[PDB]
Amino acid sequence: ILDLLLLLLTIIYSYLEALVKVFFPRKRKSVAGEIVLITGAGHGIGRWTAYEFAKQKSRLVLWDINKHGVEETAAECRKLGATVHTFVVDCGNREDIYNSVKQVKKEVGDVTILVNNAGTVYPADLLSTKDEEITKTFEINILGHFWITKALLPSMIKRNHGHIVTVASVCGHEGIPYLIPYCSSKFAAVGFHRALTLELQALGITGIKTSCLCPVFVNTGFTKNPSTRLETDTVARSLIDGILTNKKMIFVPSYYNIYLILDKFLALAAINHLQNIQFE
Amino acid sequence: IIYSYLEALVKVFFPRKRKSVAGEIVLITGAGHGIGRWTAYEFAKQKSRLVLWDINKHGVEETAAECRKLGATVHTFVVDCGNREDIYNSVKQVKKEVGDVTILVNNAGTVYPADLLSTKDEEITKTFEINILGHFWITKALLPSMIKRNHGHIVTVASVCGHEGIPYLIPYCSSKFAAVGFHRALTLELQALGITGIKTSCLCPVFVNTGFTKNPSTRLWPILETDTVARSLIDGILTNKKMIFVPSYYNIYLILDKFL
Ligand SMILES: NC(=O)c1ccc[n+]([C@@H]2O[C@H](COP(=O)([O-])OP(=O)(O)OC[C@H]3O[C@@H](n4cnc5c(N)ncnc54)[C@H](O)[C@@H]3O)[C@@H](O)[C@H]2O)c1
Ligand SMILES: NC(=O)c1ccc[n+]([C@@H]2O[C@H](COP(=O)([O-])OP(=O)(O)OC[C@H]3O[C@@H](n4cnc5c(N)ncnc54)[C@H](O)[C@@H]3O)[C@@H](O)[C@H]2O)c1
Ligand SMILES: O=C(O)c1ccc(NS(=O)(=O)c2ccc(Cl)c(Cl)c2)c2ncccc12
Ligand SMILES: O=C(O)c1ccc(NS(=O)(=O)c2ccc(Cl)c(Cl)c2)c2ncccc12
C-alpha cells in the first residue's frame, strides 16, 4: 500500500494533465428549435434538464407518470420562454409509449433529441427484493429505452439528425450492494448506449449523436443515502454541457472516469501497463 | 501480447489453488448444447452431481447420456429458463428429487441478430428474460440454502458483449451488460453481507463455434472451439476466478480500450 498509493498518485497527476492539453475549446452546438422529449421530467435530473433545454430555446415534450409534477415542470419551463407539451406516459409500458408517440407526432412533430431519464429503484438485498420490483426496474430503466428509441429513431435516421441521451448512473460501471437489480438495469443502459453508438457508426449514420449520463448519488430523493460516505441543478448543467459538445460518456463529476480505472486495475503489473500505455 | 506471456508464466510457475467440486450438486442451464453441454462434461469428469436444464428435451438427455458414460449421476429437467413460474416450480422438483444445489451455472441464452429497427419486440423481451431476468429467479431460488450452509458458487455465463458493444446486437449486448452487472453487484453484496463461503464467476468468451450465431463480429482467425471454453470455465471455477475471459488476454485489451 505504501508504494501502491504513490503509483496511483503519479497516475492521477498525468491523467488530469492529458485531459488539460486536449481541453482546448470543444464546440458548443445550438439546440434552439429542436424537439426535445424528456422522460421522467416531473422531478429531479429530468425536471432540471427540461429547465436547461428551456433556457436553450428548444421545443419541449415532457413525459412522466406523475401528472402534477410534469405540469409543475412545464409551468416553470414556460416561464423561461419555451413551448412545452406534457404527456402522462408510463415509460415502462411498450403500448403506452407507442400510443403516446402517435400523439407526439400529431400535436408536436418528429422528436430530434430523446433524453431517456425515467427510472425506478427498490433498494433491498437480493432475497428481500420482490419479483414485481425486479421486473419493473428493467421495464423502466432499460426496456423502455428500447421502445421509445425504436419509435423515435426512424425519423432521426431519415433526417440524418438526432441525439439519443441515455441517463444511466455510476451503477452502470460499478456494482453497489443492496442494489443488484438496479445496477444490472443500469449496466444494461450503458450497454444499450454503447452498442447503439457502434451500430449507428456501422450503418454510416453520421448525424445521430449519443450521450450517456452517469452521475454519482444525487440529492433528488430517488434513494435516501449514498452508498459511500451533489445537487440536482449541477447534474442538469453537466448533462446540457455534454449534449451541446457531443460527449459520449458523461460522468458527474467528470473526474469519476479516473476512480473507475482505479478499481479495474486493482495486480501490480495491471497499473504498470496503464502507466506506459497512457504516456504515449 | 506481453501481459499474456507473463500470465502464461504465472499460470505455471505459481499455480493458483484448485478446489474440489466432487459430490457438489451442480445445476447447468442451457446444457442441451454448446458451452453448457461441454461444461457438464467437465463437471462430470470432476465427479460432481448434475442437474441439467434446457427447453430442448432431446439435447439435454443426449448431454446426460454422455455425463453418465463419464461416471457422473445426472438428473434432467425440461425447464424454460426465461419463465419465472417454470423456474420456481422446477426448483421444487430439484429439491424433492436431488437436493440443495451448491453450484449454479447460468448458461442458457438467446440471440436474435438484427439492427434496432429490424428487431421484433417479442425477441427483445425474450432476450432479457433468458439472458438476465432468468438469472435473478434461479439465483433467488437457489441462494437461501447456499447462505445457510455458507457454501456455494454462482457462475454467470455472460460474453465479451457484456464489456464492449457490437453493431446489430443491441438487445443482446444490453442483456449481457446486465449479466456482468448482476455478477458484479452480487459479488459485492455477498461480501457486504459477510457471506465468505459463496463464490462468483463470470464467463466472458469471444465468438465460440457453437452455432449460437453464424459469424464473429470481427476478424478472429483462430476461432474458439466449444471444448476450450468448457476447460477455461472449469479452471476458473476451481480457482475462484471472478472475471474469466476466453481467451484470457482479452482482459488487457478491454482495459486498454477504455482511453481517449
Ligand atoms: N438520483 C440519483 O441518485 C441518481 C444517480 C444516478 C443516476 N440516476 C438516474 O437518473 C434518473 C432520474 O432520477 P432522479 O434522481 O431524477 O429521480 P426522481 O425521483 O427525482 O424523478 C424521476 C422521475 O421519473 C418519473 N418516473 C418514474 N417511473 C416512471 C414511469 N414508469 N414512467 C414515466 N416516468 C416515470 C418519476 O415520477 C419522477 O418524476 C433515473 O434514471 C436514475 O436511475 C439517479
Ligand atoms: N457461442 C458464442 O459465440 C458465445 C460467446 C460468448 C457468450 N455466449 C453465451 O454462452 C451461452 C451459451 O451459448 P452457446 O453458444 O453454448 O449456445 P447454443 O446455441 O449451443 O446452446 C444454448 C442452449 O441454451 C438453451 N436455451 C435457450 N433458451 C432457453 C431457455 N429459455 N430455457 C432453457 N434453455 C434455454 C438452448 O435450448 C440451447 O441448448 C449463452 O448464454 C451465450 O450468451 C455465447
Ligand atoms: O441512484 C444511483 O445511481 C446511485 C448512484 C451512486 C450511489 N452511490 S455513490 O455515489 O456513493 C457511488 C460513488 C462511486 C461509485 Cl463507483 C459507486 Cl458504484 C457509487 C448510489 N448510492 C445509493 C443509491 C443509489 C446510488
Ligand atoms: O455471442 C456472443 O457473445 C458473441 C461474442 C463475440 C462476438 N464477436 S468477436 O468475437 O469478434 C468480439 C471480440 C472482441 C470483442 Cl471486445 C467483441 Cl465485443 C467481439 C460475437 N459476434 C457475433 C455474434 C455474437 C458474438
mmCIF file of N, CA and C and ligand atoms in Angstrom, chain A residues 168-171 174-176 179 182 186 215-218 222-223 225-229 256 259-260 263, ligand 3:
data_model
loop_
_atom_site.group_PDB
_atom_site.id
_atom_site.type_symbol
_atom_site.label_atom_id
_atom_site.label_comp_id
_atom_site.label_asym_id
_atom_site.label_seq_id
_atom_site.Cartn_x
_atom_site.Cartn_y
_atom_site.Cartn_z
ATOM 1 N N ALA A 168 -27.919 6.873 -17.457
ATOM 2 C CA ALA A 168 -27.668 5.613 -16.751
ATOM 3 C C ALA A 168 -27.311 5.866 -15.219
ATOM 4 N N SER A 169 -26.015 5.875 -14.750
ATOM 5 C CA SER A 169 -25.567 6.034 -13.356
ATOM 6 C C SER A 169 -24.119 5.509 -13.231
ATOM 7 N N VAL A 170 -23.393 5.843 -12.131
ATOM 8 C CA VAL A 170 -22.090 5.197 -11.865
ATOM 9 C C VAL A 170 -22.300 3.652 -11.706
ATOM 10 N N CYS A 171 -23.519 3.240 -11.280
ATOM 11 C CA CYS A 171 -24.003 1.877 -11.152
ATOM 12 C C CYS A 171 -23.826 1.087 -12.422
ATOM 13 N N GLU A 174 -19.943 0.234 -12.036
ATOM 14 C CA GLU A 174 -19.508 -0.454 -10.829
ATOM 15 C C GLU A 174 -20.739 -0.865 -10.017
ATOM 16 N N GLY A 175 -20.679 -2.026 -9.386
ATOM 17 C CA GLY A 175 -21.785 -2.524 -8.585
ATOM 18 C C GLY A 175 -21.916 -1.821 -7.252
ATOM 19 N N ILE A 176 -23.082 -1.978 -6.613
ATOM 20 C CA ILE A 176 -23.381 -1.418 -5.294
ATOM 21 C C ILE A 176 -24.160 -2.491 -4.536
ATOM 22 N N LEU A 179 -28.377 -3.187 -4.283
ATOM 23 C CA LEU A 179 -28.983 -2.582 -5.468
ATOM 24 C C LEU A 179 -28.748 -3.447 -6.713
ATOM 25 N N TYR A 182 -31.058 -2.974 -9.794
ATOM 26 C CA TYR A 182 -30.868 -1.614 -10.275
ATOM 27 C C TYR A 182 -29.545 -1.459 -10.993
ATOM 28 N N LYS A 186 -28.915 -0.702 -14.945
ATOM 29 C CA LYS A 186 -28.056 0.422 -15.297
ATOM 30 C C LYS A 186 -26.855 0.016 -16.166
ATOM 31 N N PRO A 215 -24.089 9.885 -13.362
ATOM 32 C CA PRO A 215 -23.754 10.630 -12.149
ATOM 33 C C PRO A 215 -23.628 9.732 -10.927
ATOM 34 N N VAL A 216 -22.949 10.242 -9.888
ATOM 35 C CA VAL A 216 -22.853 9.568 -8.606
ATOM 36 C C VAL A 216 -24.186 9.867 -7.836
ATOM 37 N N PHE A 217 -24.267 9.688 -6.510
ATOM 38 C CA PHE A 217 -25.504 9.923 -5.779
ATOM 39 C C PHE A 217 -25.936 11.383 -5.903
ATOM 40 N N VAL A 218 -27.171 11.621 -6.333
ATOM 41 C CA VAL A 218 -27.691 12.980 -6.443
ATOM 42 C C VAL A 218 -28.835 13.139 -5.437
ATOM 43 N N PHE A 222 -34.410 10.190 -4.825
ATOM 44 C CA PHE A 222 -34.537 8.945 -5.575
ATOM 45 C C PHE A 222 -34.233 7.759 -4.635
ATOM 46 N N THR A 223 -33.218 7.920 -3.753
ATOM 47 C CA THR A 223 -32.789 6.994 -2.687
ATOM 48 C C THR A 223 -32.424 7.824 -1.452
ATOM 49 N N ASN A 225 -29.877 7.583 0.951
ATOM 50 C CA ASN A 225 -28.474 7.876 1.254
ATOM 51 C C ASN A 225 -27.510 7.360 0.177
ATOM 52 N N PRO A 226 -26.332 7.999 0.000
ATOM 53 C CA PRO A 226 -25.337 7.446 -0.938
ATOM 54 C C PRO A 226 -24.726 6.154 -0.393
ATOM 55 N N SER A 227 -24.231 5.289 -1.288
ATOM 56 C CA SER A 227 -23.624 4.031 -0.859
ATOM 57 C C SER A 227 -22.268 4.250 -0.180
ATOM 58 N N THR A 228 -21.514 5.282 -0.604
ATOM 59 C CA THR A 228 -20.215 5.569 0.009
ATOM 60 C C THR A 228 -20.265 6.919 0.724
ATOM 61 N N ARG A 229 -19.690 6.938 1.929
ATOM 62 C CA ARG A 229 -19.668 8.052 2.872
ATOM 63 C C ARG A 229 -18.762 9.194 2.416
ATOM 64 N N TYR A 256 -14.726 11.143 -12.098
ATOM 65 C CA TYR A 256 -15.039 9.768 -11.709
ATOM 66 C C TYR A 256 -14.640 8.747 -12.790
ATOM 67 N N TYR A 259 -11.558 7.354 -11.059
ATOM 68 C CA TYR A 259 -11.792 6.394 -9.968
ATOM 69 C C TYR A 259 -12.218 5.021 -10.501
ATOM 70 N N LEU A 260 -12.937 4.993 -11.621
ATOM 71 C CA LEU A 260 -13.375 3.744 -12.221
ATOM 72 C C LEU A 260 -12.193 2.955 -12.773
ATOM 73 N N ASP A 263 -10.203 0.800 -9.791
ATOM 74 C CA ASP A 263 -10.764 -0.446 -9.273
ATOM 75 C C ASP A 263 -10.489 -1.566 -10.294
HETATM 76 O O1 LIG C 3 -29.059 6.086 -7.969
HETATM 77 C C1 LIG C 3 -27.887 5.889 -8.246
HETATM 78 O O2 LIG C 3 -27.492 5.606 -9.458
HETATM 79 C C2 LIG C 3 -26.796 5.923 -7.212
HETATM 80 C C3 LIG C 3 -25.559 6.384 -7.609
HETATM 81 C C4 LIG C 3 -24.470 6.345 -6.758
HETATM 82 C C5 LIG C 3 -24.599 5.886 -5.471
HETATM 83 N N1 LIG C 3 -23.526 5.778 -4.555
HETATM 84 S S1 LIG C 3 -22.169 6.679 -4.559
HETATM 85 O O3 LIG C 3 -22.496 7.944 -5.142
HETATM 86 O O4 LIG C 3 -21.667 6.631 -3.218
HETATM 87 C C6 LIG C 3 -21.012 5.875 -5.623
HETATM 88 C C7 LIG C 3 -19.840 6.525 -5.979
HETATM 89 C C8 LIG C 3 -18.938 5.893 -6.814
HETATM 90 C C9 LIG C 3 -19.210 4.624 -7.298
HETATM 91 CL CL1 LIG C 3 -18.018 3.827 -8.285
HETATM 92 C C10 LIG C 3 -20.404 3.995 -6.964
HETATM 93 CL CL2 LIG C 3 -20.832 2.466 -7.668
HETATM 94 C C11 LIG C 3 -21.304 4.607 -6.110
HETATM 95 C C12 LIG C 3 -25.870 5.432 -5.007
HETATM 96 N N2 LIG C 3 -25.961 5.028 -3.704
HETATM 97 C C13 LIG C 3 -27.141 4.616 -3.276
HETATM 98 C C14 LIG C 3 -28.279 4.564 -4.058
HETATM 99 C C15 LIG C 3 -28.204 4.966 -5.355
HETATM 100 C C16 LIG C 3 -26.979 5.431 -5.883
#
